[PDB]
Amino acid sequence: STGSATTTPIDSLDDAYITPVQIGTPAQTLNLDFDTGSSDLWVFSSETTASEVDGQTIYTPSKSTTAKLLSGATWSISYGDGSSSSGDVYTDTVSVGGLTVTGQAVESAKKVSSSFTEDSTIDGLLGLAFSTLNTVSPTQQKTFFDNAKASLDSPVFTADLGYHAPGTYNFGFIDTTAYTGSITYTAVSTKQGFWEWTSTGYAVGSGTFKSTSIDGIADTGTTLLYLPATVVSAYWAQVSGAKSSSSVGGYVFPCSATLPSFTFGVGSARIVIPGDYIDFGPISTGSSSCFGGIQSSAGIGINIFGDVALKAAFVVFNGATTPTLGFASK
Numbered sequence: 338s339t340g341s342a343t344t345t346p347i348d349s350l351d352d353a354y355i356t357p358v359q360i361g362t363p364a365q366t367l368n369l370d371f372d373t374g375s376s377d378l379w380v381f382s383s384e385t386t387a388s389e390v391d392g393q394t395i396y397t398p399s400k401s402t403t404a405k406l407l408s409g410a411t412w413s414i415s416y417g418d419g420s421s422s423s424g425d426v427y428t429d430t431v432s433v434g435g436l437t438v439t440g441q442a443v444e445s446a447k448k449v450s451s452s453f454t455e456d457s458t459i460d461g462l463l464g465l466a467f468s469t470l471n472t473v474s475p476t477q478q479k480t481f482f483d484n485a486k487a488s489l490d491s492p493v494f495t496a497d498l499g500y501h502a503p504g505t506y507n508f509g510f511i512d513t514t515a516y517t518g519s520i521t522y523t524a525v526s527t528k529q530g531f532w533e534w535t536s537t538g539y540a541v542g543s544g545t546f547k548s549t550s551i552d553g554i555a556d557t558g559t560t561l562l563y564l565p566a567t568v569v570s571a572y573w574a575q576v577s578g579a580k581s582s583s584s585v586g587g588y589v590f591p592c593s594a595t596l597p598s599f600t601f602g603v604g605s606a607r608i609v610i611p612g613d614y615i616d617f618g619p620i621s622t623g624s625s626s627c628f629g630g631i632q633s634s635a636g637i638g639i640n641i642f643g644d645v646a647l648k649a650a651f652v653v654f655n656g657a658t659t660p661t662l663g664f665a666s667k
């Protein structure tokens with residue numbers, strides 16, 4: 338089996354991407370944020386506190402002939418940005434791009450935090466990290482990918498995120514038309530539950546490549562690229578007037594600037610992030626200070642190759658018995 342679904346940025350900045358997901362029978366289509374940094378498939382639902390729903394599409398298990406309460410199971414999750422949600426659990430049929438899983442744990446929100454409420458375009462999350470991070474208690478549940486893996490033609494999924502444009506998530510096959518050159522594979526540690534890997538270094542603009550090991554995670558549910566403070570300072574030093582603002586919460590730069598590219602290493606290969614990918618626009622409406630797309634990971638405790646990095650590549654999440662990541666230019 339394979340699946341193929343289009344993923345669409347939620348706004349003009351590529352703050353996140355949403356992918357339609359069919360849940361239940363008859364199908365209820367919700368637009369979920371596919372997140373390679375978490376392991377819960379959770380949705381706004383008929384159970385979500387009414388005051389915490391503002392424009393989302395909800396899953397209503399009572400309208401699904403295939404929904405079953407997973408008796409006694411609860412979930413509660415807290416993300417890196419301080420957002421959170423919690424609730425109870427149903428099993429139901431879930432399809433992505435024509436690939437169907439029966440008996441998938443669908444975590445129904447009773448509570449969502451303000452950031453979720455304030456984002457009308459995201460109906461929930463579909464976690465694609467390792468199932469060891471799934472928060473369901475007392476019986477941990479598997480991700481959609483882990484449940485699909487054994488029906489797939491190949492135990493893989495790929496992320497092909499667009500820059501200010503739609504992209505694709507494929508399951509079970511590698512579209513050799515979707516990238517240029519070859520795919521460079523690199524080792525993964527699953528010890529923390531993430532797609533954790535080690536970049537071989539970086540360059541700023543047309544500068545020399547610095548060979549240095551940068552451990553981090555491939556995380557489609559994080560907008561920006563978070564790297565060590567040394568690396569980030571070296572980048573923003575090439576942008577006249579850029580500075581770290583404690584008031585704004587990161588590096589800002591003059592909106593009149595032209596940003597340099599940023600290159601990261603994957604083994605002996607190189608992925609180039611164009612400068613325009615690093616522009617996240619005015620800090621507030623009408624401001625001439627713009628927010629940077631490369632930020633320090635200091636105090637996060639991990640480096641994060643979020644969408645700014647991943648959208649510059651065709652990314653293979655290889656879920657074979659020994660997982661690996663692959664990156665290709667495109």
Ligand SMILES: COC(=O)[C@H](N)Cc1ccc(F)cc1
Pocket residue numbers: 372373374375415416417418420452462556557558559
């Ligand atoms: C722990 O948070 C993360 O970094 C997730 N992988 C991405 C993520 C960030 C915010 C959010 F509301 C949902 C998901």
